[PDB]
Structure 1
């Protein structure tokens, strides 16, 4: 039965890693990575995370199953994190949170939940967006359409084309928004633009679905949520798929959550059981380790004080690199203006390099980037900065 099965195509982020490895030049650089790296080039385990893991080693007495929705404190902590400590969505018991395997797992579950218990046929994602969005939504058998977003000429948010493309969306269509640190552009709306999309969202009858994977990387844990929180003040319904991969550096333990908010307690409870029904048919119940680690840190003042500092250092290192990158490009004679790079948030950014330029970078120099010209700013260290800027200047 597997005889005529056709090879699945190679993934971009994934196909470059190898070629990089087997590149085996001398002083090469990987800017196509999808993870955080520190000054030294490694992706360490947060100290707060390691203290939490010792705690668990010493206190876990069983590995008995978790409920389908996972750890309760994990669910409280995230709700507070998203909607804020005093939010009414929480006090009116209007939101229900399920622990899932990663931000991606949260996304697939919302998809299956939506595709089987609702009249949703389409989900609108930005152009561009993390590539894996189309694949998760196509799996649950939903259509994905594209809305404008990025201005390739000016390197900003073409708010107009956005709104103008979002008028084709019908009442009842799902619209996906990146909460902060848009992947891959690094371009996020302003608070006033978030408020405008909120009003437009209820007027048109759209179902907002937020993918919140980088809370804490643009400006702060709280500032990074004004957008989502601006929609939650106005909507009756909403879905949030968040992930703790980047911000707790817990990538391989699959830690995220899919939050459902309805008009009230009875509807979320009724709607959430169908969401639990969808989890049961997929992976049954979620992996305890990462989530226990997150609940433990978020709920101890000592440990949480340390995590916030660690997350702040990551945030600040990234903001250093973006400044030092446009600065070193300038000293090296950089032909063009890369200053827009400092206006964008998070680890990603389109460098505005040409597919053929990216190829030249990888062949003639050791510089590796994704064909879209997307580079991961976290792969830049003060040490490799100079040879990197010199290679890019040589291709402009």
Structure 2
């Protein structure tokens, strides 16, 4: 039965971990997956989290089945983080959140839903975009197309190509955006550009689909959401797939949410009923651990205080590594100008390296980056900064 199966090609992102986790070279450098690292070079369990985790221990009396849509405070907390502690969607009971296995569980369930209970046929992902976006949407059945985004020559958002491209979109089509910290470009639209698009959408009849993974890594928790909230005020319906993987450092405990907004309480209610039906024949219900962690903190004033300190420390570090990168790079006499790198935001950097360069970097020097030239600034350390910069300059 399986004699004919064919091997699948390594995950461009995930796979790198293996290759890296196998070369027995003293000073290698993994700059591949998007996980935060500290000055010493490791992803520590955040402190607020360890705290929540003790509380769980001491206070948990049961492991009984969560509902299909998980814990309800988790859902509730998620919505204010998204929309506002005030907002209308909350206030008229327009949204319904389902706890899910990370951002990817959210993306996928939105896809099972759309594909089975609506009339969507295509989805519009940017160019570039996270490699797995395509895989997921295709699994559900939907056809993906691409819109124009980045201007590789200038290192800016090519708005007018972005717009024209989309003009190929049809009313009733899905158009996925990244709420902030564009991946892999790190270039986000401006609040006016967000408003514009928000309006255009509304006229062309598009169904917005936000992929929100880095809330708090660009400017702040609340201001990171302006685009999303810009759309929220104009739209009648929208789905949102958030993730607390990168902002709570809960990577492995798989924590995120799928937020369904619709015209009115009765409507979203009816739509949610199927969305559950879709969770039911996938993973059944959600894993408690992380969503319990997250909730505990989000509902405790002290804990939340500590957690919000941790986040800004992460953010700030990275901001330091990006200045220190172009600098050393400069002092190591790199050919080109790498100044744009300072202008991008989030963990990564769209380096500008070609396929062969990034390949060589690896064999030659054991410095791991994604094929596309996507580098992980958060894996950069003052201690690995010099050798890394030598590698880079030498293949350039």
* TM class, shorter-length: over 0.9
* In 2: Cα distance, 1:274 partner to 1:11 partner: 31
Q: CA deviation at 1:155?
A: 1.3
Give the SS at the match of 1:195.
helix
Q: CA deviation at 1:14?
A: 2.5
Give the SS at the match of 1:105.
helix
Give a deviation string over 1:133-179, Cα, whole Å, max 9, x none: 11111111010100011111111111111101001110000000011
Give the SS at the match of 2:341.
helix
* In 2: Cα distance, 1:109 partner to 1:127 partner: 23
* In 1: Cα distance, 2:108 partner to 2:392 partner: 38
Q: CA deviation at 1:366?
A: 2.3
* In 1: Cα distance, 2:281 partner to 2:388 partner: 48
Q: CA deviation at 1:34?
A: 2.2
Give the SS at the match of 1:209.
strand
Q: CA deviation at 1:355?
A: 1.2
Q: CA deviation at 1:23?
A: 1.9
Q: CA deviation at 1:387?
A: 1.1
Q: CA deviation at 1:40?
A: 0.9
Equivalences for 1:104-119 in 2 at 5 Å? 104-119=104-119
Give the SS at the match of 1:112.
helix
**Number of residue pairs aligned between Structure 1 and Structure 2:** 396
Give a deviation string over 1:279-313, Cα, whole Å, max 9, x none: 11111110111001111000000000000000111
Segment of structure 1 superposing worse, 193-202 or 2-11: 2-11
Give the SS at the match of 1:95.
coil
Q: CA deviation at 1:65?
A: 0.6
* In 1: Cα distance, 2:6 partner to 2:319 partner: 44
Give a deviation string over 1:30-68, Cα, whole Å, max 9, x none: 111221111111111110001001101111111111111
* In 2: Cα distance, 1:141 partner to 1:223 partner: 35
Q: CA deviation at 1:331?
A: 1.1
- Contact kept in structure 2, 1:123 and 1:142, CA below 8 Å: yes
Q: Corresponding residue for 2:26?
A: 26
* In 1: Cα distance, 2:300 partner to 2:288 partner: 18
- Contact kept in structure 2, 1:71 and 1:99, CA below 8 Å: yes
Q: CA deviation at 1:222?
A: 0.7
* In 1: Cα distance, 2:57 partner to 2:202 partner: 47
The runs of 4+ residues in structure 1 deviating greater than 6 Å are: none
Segment of structure 1 superposing worse, 328-337 or 234-243: 328-337
Give the SS at the match of 1:12.
coil
- Contact kept in structure 2, 1:179 and 1:227, CA below 8 Å: yes
Segment of structure 1 superposing worse, 195-204 or 14-23: 14-23
* In 1: Cα distance, 2:93 partner to 2:131 partner: 34
Structure 2 stretches lacking a partner, 5+ long: none
Give a deviation string over 1:179-207, Cα, whole Å, max 9, x none: 10111111110111111110111010000
* In 2: Cα distance, 1:270 partner to 1:289 partner: 29
* In 1: Cα distance, 2:364 partner to 2:275 partner: 51
* In 1: Cα distance, 2:282 partner to 2:178 partner: 25
Segment of structure 1 superposing worse, 291-300 or 353-362: 353-362
Q: CA deviation at 1:28?
A: 1.4
Give the SS at the match of 1:234.
coil
- Contact kept in structure 2, 1:33 and 1:379, CA below 8 Å: no
